[PDB]
Design a protein around this nucleic acid. Structure first.
Lengths: 80, 172, 151, 79, 151
RNA sequence: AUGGGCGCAGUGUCAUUGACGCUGACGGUACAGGCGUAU
């Protein structure tokens, strides 16, 4: 029921055998950016699959940039 | 009392005279009057363990004004080699000074000091300063102008002499 | 400075060799600070300097997540402590760290606004060193993210 | 979770190349977009196939047997 | 034995909480052994006992990968060391570990056959403890994989 | 998959705060897209 989603995620991780890093620093820049877009897509797929039925647990992950902010505020030194 | 014979080697008035004056008065000399022969200056520090006296022999660094030259090193108890990081030549001359010092003083602490690091134009990069490594010299980047590491060499020499590794200078 | 640059280069190469281990080592030492085992200004300063050293050396997603974890734990630690000295030290280190990571800042406008507002709060602080550190971090953030201030 | 929803979400997240600009600009954007569309199509077809796709036997094909043969190769040779 | 059972239960719970950290910890101490920094028979035996203790606490794939890495490192160590004493110590530790993880053995017939062949090879060994170790591991493996032996 | 010459971000070499690239967690959040093209 749950192990299958985990195997699916691990496969999707394993299904992207990065790119082959060859070429000049600008062609290699472009490969870095392409692999980064691939990572973006992988993370998006993972997060959406989480939203399917697991989202109820991992939804706050993008939203942590407001709770971390409520923690960054309130740094009050009311005492020593 | 509790004084040590210190010998300063380097290009004359290229920082040795300036360094001695700066530790003496605190002023940072601008003029370059190349040192003639040697000048012996008392220079007192106060450590957690009492007073300390350096008999600093600021020697001339110009051959024409070397005078007695190596004779100044006789009975030296510590040595501070100097060089200007802005001029590689004064660095390549470092091994010659080290040779002469060890030849006269076989077993004495040696501090390799790069003067006037404050001046933005640094030629002798920190990477290439290595002679102390094999020779086992204690190195310091210093600058008599801005006093960067202004005290580190003297503190190190005092620790090596008295034997107190954690000895610390005191204001008074 | 050459010492720091050499250490930074070595650590960046090691991170590019395996960054997960470096990330987790950072997290473990941060926890050591949190739990009071390794608590000392010197140790926390060294940890935060090291964390800054690898700024941008990792991929943005992993760097973002690691920075979020670090900042959250540091905020918890700040909440834990009393005493002006320790809180000021923690704040200074946190601000240095965030300064070292401009990419994350450019990815989050609200975070930038929060950092700058907290800098303005600090600037009125009298305790030694707070204002200087805040100004330094502010100039660094300006240099690295000027585009997002005027747009 | 259903394939239709995943495919629609995939096709929604990729903006079409902007027709505005010069011919060569639009055509280079079209080429890059078509390459990325082929990548997206490959990923979508892989998802469509199944949710596991691969067996784990590739690992023993790479490490487990490459460790077991030399495990057999182990020799005391004394000491 | 009660002490060991309590330790095993605690460590299994902790592995369920964060198995990745635990796996990193065994891997790190295993490397400390490989590099010889922490080399001693007692330490290796303790590490291997701990590794065996947590069988079944991890998902099948994670335990598989961890076992593969651990065994590869152990065989590298055995090739590395000189002296029959240490080699026998390492071999006994490996046999105990594999015995503690019969699931992997059930999933891989060829490795099981090779292990039993190596065990019979050991059985001719005269050096102290090798034969008793081999027999103990053999009975454990039999108990846990009879089906695979006769199927 | 390709990387051009410069937007300068670290710099290796020498005559070393000057020049060639590499390289820089860069001036770049840029730009280039076979010679109609349905590879």
């Amino acid at each position: 029921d749950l192990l299958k989603a985990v195997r699916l995620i691990k496969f999707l991780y394993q299904s992207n055998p990065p790119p082959n890093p060859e070429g000049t620093r600008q062609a290699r820049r472009n490969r870095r950016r392409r692999w980064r877009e691939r990572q973006r897509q992988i993370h998006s797929i993972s997060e959406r699959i989480l939203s399917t039925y697991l989202g109820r647990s991992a939804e706050p992950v993008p939203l942590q940039t407001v709770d971390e902010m409520t923690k960054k505020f309130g740094t009050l030194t009311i005492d020593c | 009392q509790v004084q040590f014979k210190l010998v300063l080697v380097g290009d004359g008035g290229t920082g040795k005279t300036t360094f001695v004056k700066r530790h003496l008065t605190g002023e940072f000399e601008k003029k370059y009057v190349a040192t003639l022969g040697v000048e012996v200056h008392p220079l007192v520090f106060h450590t957690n363990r009492g007073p300390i006296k350096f008999n600093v022999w600021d020697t001339a660094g110009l051959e024409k004004f070397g005078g007695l030259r190596d004779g100044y090193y006789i009975q030296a108890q510590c040595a501070i080699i100097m060089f200007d990081v802005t001029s590689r030549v004064t660095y390549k001359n470092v091994p010659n000074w080290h040779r002469d010092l060890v030849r006269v003083c076989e077993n004495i602490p040696i501090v390799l000091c790069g003067n006037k690091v404050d001046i933005k134009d640094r030629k002798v990069k920190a990477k290439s300063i290595v002679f102390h490594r094999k020779k086992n010299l204690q190195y310091y980047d210093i600058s008599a102008k801005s006093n960067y590491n202004f005290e580190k060499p003297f503190l190190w020499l005092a620790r090596k002499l008295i034997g107190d590794p954690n000895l610390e200078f005191v204001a008074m | 400075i050459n010492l720091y640059k050499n250490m930074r280069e070595t650590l960046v190469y090691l991170t590019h060799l395996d960054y997960v281990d470096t990330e987790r080592i950072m997290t473990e030492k941060l926890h050591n600070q949190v739990n009071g085992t390794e608590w000392s200004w010197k140790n926390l300063n060294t940890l935060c300097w090291a964390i800054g050293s690898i700024s941008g050396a990792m991929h943005e997603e992993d760097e973002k997540r690691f920075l979020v974890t670090v900042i959250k734990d540091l905020l918890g630690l700040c909440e834990q402590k009393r005493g002006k000295d320790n809180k000021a030290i923690i704040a200074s280190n946190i601000m240095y760290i965030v300064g070292q990571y401009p990419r994350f800042l450019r990815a989050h406008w609200k975070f930038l606004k929060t950092v700058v507002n907290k800098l303005f709060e600090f600037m009125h602080e009298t305790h030694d060193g707070v204002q200087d550190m805040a100004c330094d971090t502010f100039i660094k953030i300006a240099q690295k993210c000027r585009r997002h201030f005027v747009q």
